[PDB]
Design a protein around this ligand. Structure first.
Ligand SMILES: Nc1ncnc2c1ncn2[C@H]1C[C@H](O)[C@@H](COP(=O)(O)OP(=O)(O)OP(=O)(O)O)O1
Ligand SMILES: *P(=O)(O)OC[C@@H]1CC[C@H](n2cc(C)c(=O)[nH]c2=O)O1
Ligand SMILES: [Mg+2]
Length: 1010
DNA sequence: AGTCTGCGGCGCGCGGG
DNA sequence: TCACGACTACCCGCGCGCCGCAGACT
DNA sequence: TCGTGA
């Protein structure tokens, strides 16, 4: 009949028989069972205390379908052989690189194209360099055009120079450098090589390239570290640098080297700093002004100097790479990292030109037109106050008008005659003079966020006028009789210095002071000062009666400067993007499919953008790019927020994408559950695996429904709790989420939640400090135990830590939390690398037409033709199940839950938007977009023509030749340090919920020790 | 020699991911 | 009685206020 | 870099 589900002692389902056999082979161990009775008693006690024992779980029919066979007995061997197969030729080329350098030609010849210089022979004109490894550099004349001007390259036996046709003659500046990328496999090394890659001619194809661009910066980022932390690690480097610069003489003993030894090891990212650190070479940068000139005639002179400078940069980059590369190989010895770096290096974005131009024009025009009107409105009222010096009593009476300073500056005479020099304006108000930054300026310069406009439009708080003070930004006067009442309302009293100072301004005019000032609350209640009134998060107080507007214009001035913040932030970066149309280069836009099959129909507009991505830009080996990974999603009231919508696929092609769900939380649950050897051993693991995203019963949704907030807000709350936060901080976030809640209530909720979540703490001389009585106590204790280790490594792949963060380098100013954050975030990077390697191998094996388009952290997208659309999704699911199985096998568990094995939904679309059923309507864009589709696993299986085709035997024959070496997992050497009786006693104390029991257990171990 | 009179780098608020 | 001990993490760029200096007429 | 409890 039908198959029977497999359930462990907790109500958790495992995979079916066929999938178990195909993935894990045959593995069964009764030794886990042998000690499991003790572990199960402790786990049972915890699950009974919190209330999770006996609760219902989701049960689903088993899934079984055939899978491609593995290439090894275990997952580690299979991934090792695949990783070596993907990266073999380039890895051979990168090693055994030349050490000695070829001398330079005495004279360089200016002629268009590629010229080869070999010592002892005449120069030769060549079409391509045609070499396995070169070092490369590009220079551009950026004020005139975006296209390159000259380039040079160094190889093992020759020197090469490329000169543009523009400088030789003519007036057409559009040209690109050819390198024969499509037909020859080669490695190109260079600092910030993403800039250089966008200039190569053969890169503008939809077909996959055969060249690997390697970046020295990312290698320096990953190994030897840098001052990434803005204040903890970077400011220190800056202060020691300015101390070295100022005082030329160096004392024998440094003043603070003992406190912070790590200071010596770290270095800055810019290539000059890397060169002077590693290779002790000084580089001058003076020539960069010559390429700012707007005349091609100046480039004709100083040609020799510019060429020699570029060659010097090439030599410096080569000698820097020679030092960096072996240490990177020593830190990260698994081939999967190298293959993943190669995969992440190459990306492409297709788009259209006229659409881009229309988008830019619309956004800019609306932004300027919105700004001008409100500025004019405010100038018009300032003019009348400017003439109101006469009849001083009128401004004297009004408190806001009284707050204005109406003094005037007298006139100067030199030799009894007026200089009329360095005089702003003669005998005009002093406040009005400040508005003008220069004499020549005719109209006052006034803008939203200026400090004076909350006076120009009168505004009140609790029907009380606002007054500015030196120590406290804004304060409203409150009568004495109600002061305790405002203390009841939790309003904070003003500082004593300001209260003493305000008496003089009150007693002047003969006015009287019958009240004390009360500070206007900043969003943060304690020790924060309010500065600006038109800022966001003041909108809730606005129109509630907490803040009163006598001027309706303020409301308009609030709507403007809130519909146009994003465009103000990003207009520069967006408008400066480099786009290349198809009409300029007709022969280069080539389809992904090998068979063209005609039907081009002379497509009017196409364009390609090459994103400039640094693959490793953080201590946690994450990638950086300034515009696209930091692009905002579409919003109804924000002008120009449809950026990612501009990417479109060419006809006959589509985008297939996926996103990982609850990644870091799942990794944390796994590393917590590793000790028990059973999935769901901890309470937080059971509260992670309780349900699925589709049914709506995930952990984040439950947190959202308990706290009454959105799912994103719950995500912020949970991640902040996990990395380490405070109850006051969490209560503050609850105050942001709902403005109608009294502070004491939020504090009470935060305290009860944290008391249930974390639990109590205990300090003992044998067992150091540990947590007990909490749901996530074991997860924490394991994290601090692994953070303290001498040589920390990533649990999955054994990647080492940077030199700067090592505890030997730091004897003061220790940074414990960064290590905890680093381990998990790095594990996420390892997940991404495994996904990319598996997808590449499957694509190459089954001859699918596919190429990676973009990968924003968890999110991954591909460009796939119409015929192969479902096959890519099938490959994605296979990649996901392999990656999850590898993660479980490394920790010591040989089983996997069924619910978390596969992606929830895989989406097929034509443009880049977050959800397929989104209209994406902005103030600039008034046209709806047709919907795509999203499929789960069953809807993927029942569709026809979604199965893989016939394989190729030669690929397996090539994979089979590589070798495999056994390695012991990282947690085993950690566990062999501790003796088993100490382990059983430590766990037995960690499960107790009362302090007296823990004391008794400690004494019982002391008696057993004898 | 005095007498003011601008001025660009540094740092903090404030938004995007 | 002191010994921790605190504390979301990883990134990007723009606008306004402040200060230690350069520069044009007595 | 001051603050705090068991
Ligand atoms: N406020 C945040 N604080 C710390 N880390 C964050 C934060 N936001 C996002 N991240 C980190 C942790 C996330 O697992 C990871 C990916 O972002 P995100 O997609 O929002 O989480 P997620 O993978 O659980 O989404 P989902 O489950 O809906 O697919 O980056
Ligand atoms: P955006 O699409 O919103 O974010 C994409 C990725 C997800 C993870 C990373 N990230 C985003 C945000 C908003 C954050 O605060 N911290 C992150 O690490 O960027
Ligand atoms: Mg996600």
């Amino acid at each position: 009949t039908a198959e029977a589900p497999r359930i462990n002692p907790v109500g958790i389902q495992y995979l079916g028989e066929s999938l178990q056999r195909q993935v894990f082979g045959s593995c069964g161990g009764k030794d886990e069972v042998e000690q499991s009775d003790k572990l199960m008693e402790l786990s049972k006690k915890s699950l009974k205390d919190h209330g999770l024992w006996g609760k219902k779980t989701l049960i689903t029919d088993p899934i079984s379908f055939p899978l491609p066979p593995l290439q090894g007995r275990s997952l580690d061997e299979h991934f090792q052989k695949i990783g070596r197969f993907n990266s073999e030729p380039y890895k051979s080329f990168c090693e055994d690189k030349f050490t000695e350098m070829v001398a330079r030609p005495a004279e360089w010849l200016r002629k268009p194209g590629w010229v080869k210089y070999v010592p002892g022979m005449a120069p030769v004109e060549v079409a391509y360099p045609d070499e396995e490894l070169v070092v490369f550099d590009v220079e551009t004349l950026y004020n005139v055009s975006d296209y390159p001007t000259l380039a040079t390259a160094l190889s093992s036996t020759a020197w090469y120079l490329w000169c543009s046709p523009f400088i030789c003659g003519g007036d057409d500046p559009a040209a690109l450098i050819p390198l024969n990328t499509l037909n020859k496999e080669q490695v190109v090394i260079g600092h910030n090589v993403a800039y250089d890659r966008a200039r190569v001619l053969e890169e503008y194809n939809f077909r996959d390239s055969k060249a690997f661009f390697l970046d020295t910066q990312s290698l320096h980022i990953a190994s030897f570290g840098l001052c990434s932390r803005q204040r903890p690690m970077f400011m220190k480097n800056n202060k020691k640098k300015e101390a070295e610069v100022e005082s030329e003489v160096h004392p024998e003993i440094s003043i603070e080297d003992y406190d912070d030894p790590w200071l010596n090891v770290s270095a800055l990212n810019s290539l000059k700093d890397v060169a002077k650190f590693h290779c002790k070479i000084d580089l001058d940068k003076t020539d960069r002004d010559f390429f700012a000139s707007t005349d091609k005639s100046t480039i004709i002179e100083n040609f020799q100097k510019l060429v020699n400078y570029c060659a010097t940069d090439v030599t410096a980059t080569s000698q820097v790479f020679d030092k960096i590369f072996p240490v990177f190989l020593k830190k990260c010895p698994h081939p999967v990292s190298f293959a993943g770096l190669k995969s992440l290096s190459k990306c492409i974005l297709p788009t259209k030109l006229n659409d881009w131009n229309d988008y830019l024009n619309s956004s800019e025009s609306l932004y300027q037109q919105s700004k001008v009107q409100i500025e004019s409105k405010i100038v018009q009222i300032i003019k009348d106050i400017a003439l109101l010096k006469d009849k001083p009593d009128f401004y004297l009476k009004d408190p806001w008008l009284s707050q204005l300073d109406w003094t005037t500056k007298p006139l100067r005479l030199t030799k009894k005659g007026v200089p009329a020099k360095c005089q702003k304006l003669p005998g005009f108000p002093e406040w009005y003079r400040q508005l003008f930054p220069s004499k020549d300026t005719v109209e006052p310069k006034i803008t939203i966020k200026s400090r004076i406009i909350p006076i120009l439009f009168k505004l009140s708080w609790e029907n009380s006028p606002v007054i500015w003070s030196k120590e406290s930004g804004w304060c409203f006067n409150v009568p004495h009789e109600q002061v305790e009442t405002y203390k009841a309302k939790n309003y904070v009293l003003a500082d004593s210095v300001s209260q003493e100072e305000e008496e003089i301004r009150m007693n002047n005019l003969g006015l009287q002071c019958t009240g004390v000032l009360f500070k206007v609350p900043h969003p943060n209640g304690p020790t924060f000062n309010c500065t600006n009134l038109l800022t966001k998060s003041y909108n809730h107080f606005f129109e509630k009666g907490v803040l009163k507007s006598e001027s309706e214009l303020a409301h308009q001035a609030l709507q403007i400067n809130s519909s146009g913040s994003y465009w103000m932030s990003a207009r520069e970066r967006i408008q400066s993007q480099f786009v290349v149309p198809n009409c300029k280069f007709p022969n280069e836009f080539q389809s992904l499919s090998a068979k063209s099959s005609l039907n081009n129909e002379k497509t009017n507009d196409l364009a390609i953008i090459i994103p400039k991505i640094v693959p490793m830009g953080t201590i946690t080996r994450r990638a950086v790019e300034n515009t696209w990974l930091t692009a905002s999603n579409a919003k109804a009231n924000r002008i120009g927020s449809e950026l990612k919508t501009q990417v479109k696929a060419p006809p006959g092609y589509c985008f297939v994408g996926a996103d990982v769900d609850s990644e870091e939380l799942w990794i944390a649950s796994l590393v917590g559950d590793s000790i028990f050897n059973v999935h769901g051993g901890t309470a937080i693991g059971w509260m992670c695996l309780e349900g699925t995203k589709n049914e709506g019963t995930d952990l984040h949704t439950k947190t959202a429904q308990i706290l009454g907030c959105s799912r994103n807000e719950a995500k912020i709350f949970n991640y902040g709790r996990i990395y380490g936060a405070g109850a006051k901080f969490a209560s503050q976030l609850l105050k942001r989420f709902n403005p109608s809640l009294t502070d004491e209530e939020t504090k009470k909720i935060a305290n009860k939640l944290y008391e249930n979540t974390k639990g109590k703490t205990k300090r003992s001389k044998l067992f150091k400090k540990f947590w007990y009585g909490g749901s996530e106590s074991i997860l924490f204790n394991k994290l601090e135990s692994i953070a303290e280790q001498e040589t920390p490594k990533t649990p999955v792949l054994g990647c080492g830590i940077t030199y700067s963060l090592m505890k030997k380098n730091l004897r003061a100013n220790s940074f414990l939390p960064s290590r905890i954050n680093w381990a998990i975030q790095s594990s996420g990077v390892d997940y991404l690398h495994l996904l990319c390697c598996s997808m590449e191998y499957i694509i190459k094996k089954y001859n699918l037409e596919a190429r990676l388009c973009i990968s924003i952290h968890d999110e991954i997208r591909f460009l796939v033709s119409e015929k192969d659309k479902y096959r890519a999704a099938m490959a994605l699911q296979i990649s996901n199940i392999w990656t999850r199985a590898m993660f479980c096998q490394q920790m010591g568990i040989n089983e996997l839950p069924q619910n978390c094995a596969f992606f929830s939904q895989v989406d097929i679309d034509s443009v880049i938007r977050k959800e397929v059923n989104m209209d994406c309507i902005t103030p600039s864009n008034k046209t709806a977009i047709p919907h795509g589709e999203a499929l789960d696993i069953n809807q993927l299986l029942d569709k026809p023509n979604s199965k893989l085709g016939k394989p190729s035997l030669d690929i397996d024959s090539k994979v089979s030749q590589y070798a495999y070496n056994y390695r012991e997992p990282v947690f085993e050497e950690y566990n062999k340090s501790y003796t088993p009786e100490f382990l059983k006693y430590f766990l037995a104390m960690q499960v107790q919920s009362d302090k007296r029991d823990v004391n008794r257990l400690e004494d019982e171990y002391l008696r057993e020790c004898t």
